[PDB]
Amino acid sequence: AYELPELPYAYDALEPHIDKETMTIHHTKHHNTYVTNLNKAVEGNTALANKSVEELVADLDSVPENIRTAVRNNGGGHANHKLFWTLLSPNGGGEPTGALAEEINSVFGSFDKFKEQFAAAAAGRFGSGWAWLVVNNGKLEITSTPNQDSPLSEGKTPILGLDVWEHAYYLNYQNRRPDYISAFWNVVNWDEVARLYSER
């Protein structure tokens, strides 16, 4: 009984970094489709349905082989986008602070180095996928996954993610993925990332 979450802001609140039309289609069509298909996949499996989408994707091995693909793709779609909306803000941007900033400077050397490495991962993901900042064994690291696969399935907790499926940027940037990635930094809600960091 999963549901499509409402956005924390207006559809045009992230302009011009992300266009109103993309936000509208991305949320009401793409994300919504993952929710619809996810509910159809777990229909009848009270056990799986009672778990949060994150818990569900965290253990795909416990999902029946007959619907494992559907849960992987659609569960991943729902988990990834639900997190993604909460990481954006019309009042975001800037740089991390507190414990998160300290960890970033210690692991990557500096926030600028982190952005360079994160941008490289996002640009290097061939095909559809996501670029991530996760906590693995209590350590921060950058990774990328294909399609709707989530780091949660490998025991890693994402605290920042960038959707690099073409639907996330084609209307305003077309083939210019690097320009989309650069614009991303202007809307990142580092306060939310910091909260997820503490929880991870």
Which residues, 89 to 128, sit near a second copy by CB under 8 A? 126-128
Candidates 10-18, 49-57, 131-139, 160-168; binding stretch for a second copy (CB under 8 A): 160-168
Binding string to a second copy for residues 14 to 53, with x set by CB under 8 A, is what?
A: -----------x---xx--x--------------------
Q: Which does 89 bind (CB under 5 to 8 A by kind): Mn ion, a second copy, none?
A: none
Examine residue 73 and tell whether it contacts a second copy (CB under 8 A): yes
After which residues does the chain show a gap where C to N exceeds 2.5 Å?
A: none
Bridging pattern class, strands 157-163 and 129-136: antiparallel
Q: Is the peptide bond before 151 cis (omega within 30 degrees of 0)?
A: no
Nearest to Mn ion of 76, 96 (CB atom): 76
Distant-in-sequence, close-in-space partners of 142: CB < 8 Å, separation ≥ 6? 114, 117, 118, 121, 131, 132, 133, 134
Report residue 148: phi and psi, to 5°.
-115, 20
Shortest distance in whole angstroms from residue 10 CB to a second copy: 20
Tell me how far apart the alpha carbons of residues 157 and 133 are, in angstroms, rounded to a whole number. 9
Annotated binding-site members for Mn(2+)? 26, 81, 163, 167
Residues lying near a second copy in the complex (CB under 8 A): 25, 29-30, 33, 73, 126-129, 146-148, 165-167, 170-171, 174-175
